[PDB]
Amino acid sequence: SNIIKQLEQEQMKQDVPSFRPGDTVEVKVWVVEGSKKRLQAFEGVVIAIRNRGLHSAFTVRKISNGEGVERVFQTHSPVVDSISVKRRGAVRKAKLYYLRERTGKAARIKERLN
Amino acid sequence: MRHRKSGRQLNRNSSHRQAMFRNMAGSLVRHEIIKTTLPKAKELRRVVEPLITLAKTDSVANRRLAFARTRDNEIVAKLFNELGPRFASRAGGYTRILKCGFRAGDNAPMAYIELVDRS
Amino acid sequence: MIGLVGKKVGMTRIFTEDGVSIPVTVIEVEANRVTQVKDLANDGYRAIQVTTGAKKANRVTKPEAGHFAKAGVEAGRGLWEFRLAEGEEFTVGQSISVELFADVKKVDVTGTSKGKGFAGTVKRWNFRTQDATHGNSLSHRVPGSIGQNQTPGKVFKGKKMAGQMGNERVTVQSLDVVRVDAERNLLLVKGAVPGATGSDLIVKPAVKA
Amino acid sequence: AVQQNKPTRSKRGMRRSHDALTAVTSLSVDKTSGEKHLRHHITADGYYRGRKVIAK
Amino acid sequence: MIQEQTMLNVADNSGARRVMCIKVLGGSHRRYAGVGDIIKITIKEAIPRGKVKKGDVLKAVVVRTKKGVRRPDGSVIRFDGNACVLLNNNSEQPIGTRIFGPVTRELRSEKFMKIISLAPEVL
RNA sequence: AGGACCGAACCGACUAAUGUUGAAAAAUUAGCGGAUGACUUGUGGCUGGGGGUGAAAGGCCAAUCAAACCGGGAGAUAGCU
RNA sequence: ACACAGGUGGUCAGGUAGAGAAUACCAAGGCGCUUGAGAGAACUCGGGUGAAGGAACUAGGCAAAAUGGUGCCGUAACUUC
RNA sequence: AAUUCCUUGUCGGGUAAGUUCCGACCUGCACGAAUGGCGUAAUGAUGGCCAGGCUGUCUCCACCCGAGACUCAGUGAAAU
RNA sequence: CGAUGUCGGCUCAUCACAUCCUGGGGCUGAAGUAGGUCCCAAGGGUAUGGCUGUUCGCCAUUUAAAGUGGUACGCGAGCUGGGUUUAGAACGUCGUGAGACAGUUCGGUCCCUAUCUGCCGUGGGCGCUGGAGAACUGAGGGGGGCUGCUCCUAGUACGAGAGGACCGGAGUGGACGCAUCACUGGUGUUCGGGUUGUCAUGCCAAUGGCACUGCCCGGUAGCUAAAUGCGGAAGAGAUAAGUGCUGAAAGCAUCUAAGCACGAAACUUGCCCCGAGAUGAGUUCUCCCUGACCCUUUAAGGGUCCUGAAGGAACGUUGAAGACGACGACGUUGAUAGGCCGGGUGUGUAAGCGCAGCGAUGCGUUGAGCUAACCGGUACUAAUGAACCGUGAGGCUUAACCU
Ligand SMILES: [Mg+2]
Ligand SMILES: [Mg+2]
Ligand SMILES: [Mg+2]
Ligand SMILES: [Mg+2]
Ligand SMILES: [Mg+2]
Ligand SMILES: [Mg+2]
Ligand SMILES: [Mg+2]
Ligand SMILES: [Mg+2]
Ligand SMILES: [Mg+2]
Ligand SMILES: [Mg+2]
Ligand SMILES: [Mg+2]
Ligand SMILES: [Mg+2]
Ligand SMILES: [Mg+2]
Ligand SMILES: [Mg+2]
Ligand SMILES: [Mg+2]
Ligand SMILES: [Mg+2]
Ligand SMILES: [Mg+2]
Ligand SMILES: [Mg+2]
Ligand SMILES: [Mg+2]
Ligand SMILES: [Mg+2]
Ligand SMILES: [Mg+2]
Ligand SMILES: [Mg+2]
Ligand SMILES: [Mg+2]
Ligand SMILES: [Mg+2]
Ligand SMILES: [Mg+2]
Ligand SMILES: [Mg+2]
Ligand SMILES: [Mg+2]
Ligand SMILES: [Mg+2]
Ligand SMILES: [Mg+2]
Ligand SMILES: [Mg+2]
Ligand SMILES: [Mg+2]
Ligand SMILES: [Mg+2]
Ligand SMILES: [Mg+2]
Ligand SMILES: [Mg+2]
Ligand SMILES: [Mg+2]
Ligand SMILES: [Mg+2]
Ligand SMILES: [Mg+2]
Ligand SMILES: [Mg+2]
Ligand SMILES: [Mg+2]
Ligand SMILES: [Mg+2]
Ligand SMILES: [Mg+2]
Ligand SMILES: [Mg+2]
Ligand SMILES: [Mg+2]
Ligand SMILES: [Mg+2]
Ligand SMILES: [Mg+2]
Ligand SMILES: [Mg+2]
Ligand SMILES: [Mg+2]
Ligand SMILES: [Mg+2]
Ligand SMILES: [Mg+2]
Ligand SMILES: [Mg+2]
Ligand SMILES: [Mg+2]
Ligand SMILES: [Mg+2]
Ligand SMILES: [Mg+2]
Ligand SMILES: [Mg+2]
Ligand SMILES: [Mg+2]
Ligand SMILES: [Mg+2]
Ligand SMILES: [Mg+2]
Ligand SMILES: [Mg+2]
Ligand SMILES: [Mg+2]
Ligand SMILES: [Mg+2]
Ligand SMILES: [Mg+2]
Ligand SMILES: [Mg+2]
Ligand SMILES: [Mg+2]
Ligand SMILES: [Mg+2]
Ligand SMILES: [Mg+2]
Ligand SMILES: [Mg+2]
Ligand SMILES: [Mg+2]
Ligand SMILES: [Mg+2]
Ligand SMILES: [Mg+2]
Ligand SMILES: [Mg+2]
Ligand SMILES: [Mg+2]
Ligand SMILES: [Mg+2]
Ligand SMILES: [Mg+2]
Ligand SMILES: [Mg+2]
Ligand SMILES: [Mg+2]
Ligand SMILES: [Mg+2]
Ligand SMILES: [Mg+2]
Ligand SMILES: [Mg+2]
Ligand SMILES: [Mg+2]
Ligand SMILES: [Mg+2]
Ligand SMILES: [Mg+2]
Ligand SMILES: [Mg+2]
Ligand SMILES: [Mg+2]
Ligand SMILES: [Mg+2]
Ligand SMILES: [Mg+2]
């Protein structure tokens, strides 16, 4: 409705950069440990993007310490602070769920130049 | 339960409904008035009227789309040469339902569905 | 304390500064205007009768339109009634805004739930299904046994059986109110209230505190 | 799954108490041809709300 | 989201490779166990010379789930497998000395301050 | 070469579900076994009831079998209902 | 007993793919199975997909799911070789 | 033990836990040598047990597609 | 005995209290903690596995606890068919034998479309005394009632130490329940794409049909749980066991006889829902009707003509309402549904053309094209002028007022 959209567009963030699935992205989130807010980095491959305006989200997969870690960030949440596209990739799907069984050389994605 | 859903099942499976409305939309373009049952007449508006709106822009691509929906070149020719420019100013609502009583074989509530600019 | 009559606009979320997402339910609350003040001398109890929204003039009936004309107020889409506490009073044509909830902290939201229709005992009363294999003859989601043998030639009252589920008055208690926006007539409560989108809601301050 | 006593014709009449048909309330009359039809249906000659909606 | 009969990988150098949850502790009829939850387990596969032995029965704390754990913004952190760190039965401190793979911020407490200390990465 | 192997026709009937006033007085559906042999099938023949026939289950002998069917003794007899 | 999802011997054997008379789609040819129309509850029937777990179900992995082809590599105990 | 009453014998293995299973023991209620004894490769829509894969079997069900059920019109049973 | 289906499991249960947990007490050979024992208390709660057909039992590991019983050893016109208990076969054993064995072993058809009671839902009729539209009160009925752990009080009381509280407060769980779809997900045979075989559209190109939606990949709305909100209370009243105060009978003593006080998850309330068919049919508010005459058996009488209100119903467009009724929205003075326009979302760069390449193909046009149920708009189509039902001041008897 008009009432919902007015409440949601005033909470959105005006600086979300344009990224596609397959872009190697680097997300800086806020971490409150003890009492000092620090800014932990998270960097992997965008395997899914779900666009719903304020409720928009995206999924980042990385291979951390041998283990694969998926993390579904809420885009307009303030606990994420920066989103930076490190390396943009060339895929032909909207959601890269097949990377959950590809490792090493098989899970490469080529670079979307230009 | 059927909350906020759309489309009538009409006691058919999905491929039969698509092939029945493919035949029936071509039959309505061909004769400009047909007599069918009232649930099938109301559900036919969601098929024919997107085809007529498709026919307002005569491109080669839209001929291929309208052929992919109907699979009859005589209907696609009638859509873009006649019913395209006939309805070129109307903002939708290209057809009209006229309830015509009850079928003698099974008491089915029938209806005439016709194009607006017919008579 | 009295409550107010609103409408379920939908659900959204309020991102706090701390990184917490609060799932909220937007309830628009237009100006509730009173239509009748009830008292002990005439009615035996103390309450007010409010109205909200608008209604088509050709559709409000002459008995109903005469009731608004006595109070001298525009016809609203319904008539609800809130019991008065002691030391609490209102005039007849008085309008009541959403600023009444400016300093409450928890509310109870009463609505009519969604209509599930005729529901079976797996869905309605959370019965266990029987075995889906191992020989079961036509009895996968049936309620099973319903009584005992000859001792009570009879099934007891209130036995959990299939029937109408939902489409009835339910009240969710102690909802945390998040934001009271008087300028655009809104009310944000934490969590999910009953009812579909666009249905009437009765928001009262919480009685269990 | 079957009865133990013959139900009476009185009980039979009480079950058929709701099986009565409802006659049509009033037939609408066309303003041009003046003939009677079902409300919101076309006439037998092919009129509906005045105009001749279908030839014959 | 670990229940009975669930096989888990082992996240430390305690000597086990593959353990099975046999009881989700802390409450009657308790179905599941997320991260930070104590489970009684058995050992199904071990290294030849470890602190633990095949068939031992002991406790464990779940540190990684494939279902994942949710953060108060609404975000969720999923892993590709199920991993737990073995505990002593009584003292309920970890047996191994080196934690493998990441853990989460839900794990840290006064109870498991040692495990997040030894983890290579805390998400 | 094969009472060989895998597998359709064909022959059989292991399991489940349906069906159980059925579509069907034993079937359908999805699987299943054999499938050049002690195989299977058409047509015609022969064996008759204390008899036949039986790779034997008291199986089969016209939807009937610890003695078929039909007619007769016959209105058997019934201290039983 | 039925205009009955059964049973019934012989002959004819197109295309594409395929080892094939399997199977998919078609030709020649023949059909749409003699109640329909709506609606889109529980429940039943026949199916589809499923988070996390993976036999904890159960008398029993019943049923489902899974495996599935060709070529090449490679292949244990035991053995009447 | 297709045989063992006592018996879930005892011991060992397998399992977190095994009245079943497997290996022993012999105290064979009441094995035993062509109403055959003991072995035995291959074979079995055979019996019991274990493991891998697999999964709505299950924790605990959810949704969907169709055929009924439901409503209308036509025909129109049955047991009791 | 002209048939009352049986062990165990499954799925629903329900009651008792001789109480397993939680609650309240008394005594203790009760320091504390933890117990023993008995009294009160049935409000709620009250495991999962291994083995076995098992109930049971043993064992593993839980838990505050894993209560004992009644219910045709509850429950097969609800399910299962492992056990028992048909016909086959075998062992041991008995018998010359046919055969037999609460000895064992392998195999072995579980039917019923609900007339009545009952129960879960949902309607029609009529009533409630003129008719109608609403809002109610609450007689009564139902729901709900569980609890861990940590922290503080406080290492305080207690204790030789070891240990370690009552009372009170805060947090966070398990199980259960209600609601919801904002999140995370599932589904999504009505959206998009990939692709195998084949057939067709004259052919190319491009599509469509069929093959389980052909096989997949994603996915809108909706519905959903595993997702996330919320709930159990506090309080009050009267109490149980119990504890008392004052106090005689009985100069004392004594909780009781007179009088008074305290006392539990039980009881009545408080919370939620239904609820005036509550025939004892209630209350409030508003709206509508202010015509003539005939009749004989003169009465709560019958009829004629005129009149047809408020409202309702029917019909139509329909719905996050729904089996059907019902309920809700709307019917031109109109956004009810469809279409249309715009947006969003999803899918992932359409077709055509051009270029590069021997070609498969790649690139540009191009985040293109298509896009369901969604959002905001828009009378384009369909929601008709009517007709129909409902009437025309509403009994008697007193009483109090009014003139
Ligand atoms: Mg709709
Ligand atoms: Mg039909
Ligand atoms: Mg198809
Ligand atoms: Mg509904
Ligand atoms: Mg079950
Ligand atoms: Mg059966
Ligand atoms: Mg079934
Ligand atoms: Mg019974
Ligand atoms: Mg009785
Ligand atoms: Mg009788
Ligand atoms: Mg009837
Ligand atoms: Mg052979
Ligand atoms: Mg045979
Ligand atoms: Mg078959
Ligand atoms: Mg073969
Ligand atoms: Mg015999
Ligand atoms: Mg015979
Ligand atoms: Mg004879
Ligand atoms: Mg004889
Ligand atoms: Mg004689
Ligand atoms: Mg005689
Ligand atoms: Mg026929
Ligand atoms: Mg051929
Ligand atoms: Mg074939
Ligand atoms: Mg037929
Ligand atoms: Mg259905
Ligand atoms: Mg499947
Ligand atoms: Mg699954
Ligand atoms: Mg998926
Ligand atoms: Mg999975
Ligand atoms: Mg088991
Ligand atoms: Mg079990
Ligand atoms: Mg099987
Ligand atoms: Mg299969
Ligand atoms: Mg013996
Ligand atoms: Mg024995
Ligand atoms: Mg096992
Ligand atoms: Mg042993
Ligand atoms: Mg077993
Ligand atoms: Mg042995
Ligand atoms: Mg012998
Ligand atoms: Mg001998
Ligand atoms: Mg022998
Ligand atoms: Mg009928
Ligand atoms: Mg008897
Ligand atoms: Mg009898
Ligand atoms: Mg007692
Ligand atoms: Mg005590
Ligand atoms: Mg009780
Ligand atoms: Mg109880
Ligand atoms: Mg009670
Ligand atoms: Mg109480
Ligand atoms: Mg047990
Ligand atoms: Mg007894
Ligand atoms: Mg019994
Ligand atoms: Mg019992
Ligand atoms: Mg039984
Ligand atoms: Mg049996
Ligand atoms: Mg025998
Ligand atoms: Mg016997
Ligand atoms: Mg009624
Ligand atoms: Mg009560
Ligand atoms: Mg409590
Ligand atoms: Mg949702
Ligand atoms: Mg949504
Ligand atoms: Mg999804
Ligand atoms: Mg799908
Ligand atoms: Mg969804
Ligand atoms: Mg094709
Ligand atoms: Mg081509
Ligand atoms: Mg075809
Ligand atoms: Mg075909
Ligand atoms: Mg209290
Ligand atoms: Mg005294
Ligand atoms: Mg005294
Ligand atoms: Mg008191
Ligand atoms: Mg307008
Ligand atoms: Mg519209
Ligand atoms: Mg659009
Ligand atoms: Mg997009
Ligand atoms: Mg292009
Ligand atoms: Mg395409
Ligand atoms: Mg580009
Ligand atoms: Mg796009
Ligand atoms: Mg709209």
From TrEMBL, chain B:
GO MF entry, a single one: structural constituent of ribosome
Name of the featured protein: Large ribosomal subunit protein bL17
Source domain of life: Bacteria
InterPro entries linked to this entry: Ribosomal_bL17, Ribosomal_bL17_CS, Ribosomal_bL17_sf
One Gene Ontology CC term in the entry: cytosolic large ribosomal subunit
UniProtKB keywords: Metal-binding, Ribonucleoprotein, Ribosomal protein
Source organism of this protein record: Escherichia coli
GO BP annotations listed: translation
Chain residues that bind Mg(2+): H3
PANTHER family reported in the protein's UniProt record: LARGE RIBOSOMAL SUBUNIT PROTEIN BL17M, RIBOSOMAL PROTEIN L17
Similarity remark: Belongs to the bacterial ribosomal protein bL17 family.
Quaternary structure annotation from Swiss-Prot or TrEMBL: Part of the 50S ribosomal subunit. Contacts protein L32.
PROSITE patterns in alphabetical order: RIBOSOMAL_L17
NCBIfam families assigned: L17
